[PDB]
Structure formats: C-alpha cells, structure tokens
Design a protein around this ligand. Sequence first.
Ligand code: ZN
Ligand code: ZN
Ligand code: ZN
Ligand code: ZN
Ligand code: ZN
Ligand code: ZN
Lengths: 131, 131
Amino acid sequence: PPVKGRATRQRAAVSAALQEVEEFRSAQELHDMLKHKGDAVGLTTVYRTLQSLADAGEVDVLRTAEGESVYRRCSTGDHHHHLVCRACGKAVEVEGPAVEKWAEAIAAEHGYVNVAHTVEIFGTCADCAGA
Amino acid sequence: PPVKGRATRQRAAVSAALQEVEEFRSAQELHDMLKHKGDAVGLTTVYRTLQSLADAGEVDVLRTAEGESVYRRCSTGDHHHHLVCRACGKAVEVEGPAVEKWAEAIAAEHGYVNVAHTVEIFGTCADCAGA
Ligand SMILES: [Zn+2]
Ligand SMILES: [Zn+2]
Ligand SMILES: [Zn+2]
Ligand SMILES: [Zn+2]
Ligand SMILES: [Zn+2]
Ligand SMILES: [Zn+2]
C-alpha cells in the first residue's frame, strides 16, 4: 500500500503489519501487535496512516457491531464483498453481480442518481459450532 | 408499539413520537423534538426505551456512516432492506429475493451454520438535484 507522502519506517512498518495478517482489526489491535513485535509506533500515527490508506482505498474498512472501524488489506483490488466470522475474524472474498444489478434496478426505479451499497454478511464457521 | 414494561406515560409518549415521525433519526434528535413537543422526557429514558423496542423487533435500526445510530418505524412487519438518502434522511423500504438467494448460496457453499446479512444502501434522491 504505497502512501502519497515520503515513505518512512513507521509507514513501512504499518504497511508490513497490514500485509502480514489477513483478518479484520482496528487501530488499537494493530498498534498492540506492532508495539509487541518491536515497532514502537504511535496510535495517532497509525490512525492517520490508515485514514490516508482508506482514502486511497488500498485497504478495506468495516464498522463492527459496536461501531468501531476495523481494517483489512484485501488481496483483490476490484469491487468485492467480504463474508466475515466474528468468532474467527477470517474474511472470505465473495462477489456477486446479482446484488449489483438489483441495486441498479431499484435505484433506476426510484429515480436515484447514485448508489453506494453497504453490504455485509456475518456468520459462523462449521468449526465454530463444533467443540 | 407495545412495550414489555408496565404501562407508563413515558413509553406511550416516546412510542407516539416515533410513530409520528417517518424518518431515521438519532437518539439526541428524538429527545430534542420530544422536548419541543412538551413531553419533557429524559435522554437516558429515550435510550433505554429505544433499546427495548429494538430488542422487541418493532423498530428498525441503522448505523450512520460517521458512527452514530438512527432509528425508524416501518409499518411492514416482514423482513426488508432500506434505501436511505443521507442528504435528506428519508428512508424507503424494499425487498428483493436476490440478496436472500445469494446469502443462502454463499452459506451453503462455505458451510456456515447460520448467517445474518445487513443490507442498508444509500443514494441521493431526485429533489437533491432540483434547485
Ligand atoms: Zn478484499
Ligand atoms: Zn458490490
Ligand atoms: Zn469462525
Ligand atoms: Zn423498515
Ligand atoms: Zn435526498
Ligand atoms: Zn435480506
């Protein structure tokens, strides 16, 4: 995830941390993990970096049930949706043109100019049910 | 909108105020308009009664983009999704089988035991362009 400004070891470290993992996580959790592995990087610094990255779109955002935003550097850059298990945190890249066509159709029927769909599916793995 | 608690003027007043308005609105906005109407009801009371109603399923919840929560009453008791114009705040309920079929297919393919899909979509309506 290249940054608009000059690259610095803090930005490189947070980028390495983002690409290191695949689950969704907030600024606090990634701050914890980077400090524990030996980065010593600021909370507001990582917050600003992920704000800039989300503005660039290199990472994907998701508001949890409480409300806090979690972030995930997704491999696929095209339009896509994520199936997320809260017990595991794993994200599966799922995309369907049917929902996009439905959104376009309902927007046209209602005469709406632009459509910005917010779709998320929350579930549990089969292993989660098993003990 | 019956409330699980005993019959009191607070619950009746907040339920009537919610019924009168047909726009997604935050707890603070509901408290302010209730105060202006002369109810003189507490903000914590508004929050508690609103949470009780949301747990009862008689009301529809939604999370704002910035983080706050808005709530609205829809006449239909059946499951439905919402199109909400951020510029005006007006919300309209629709239902399309395609999202349900896609969710079922994804759950079957990935083996997820149970899933909970949230589909709330946003777009500007015609009067926004009109001047
Ligand atoms: Zn992705
Ligand atoms: Zn999509
Ligand atoms: Zn799981
Ligand atoms: Zn509704
Ligand atoms: Zn509008
Ligand atoms: Zn649905």
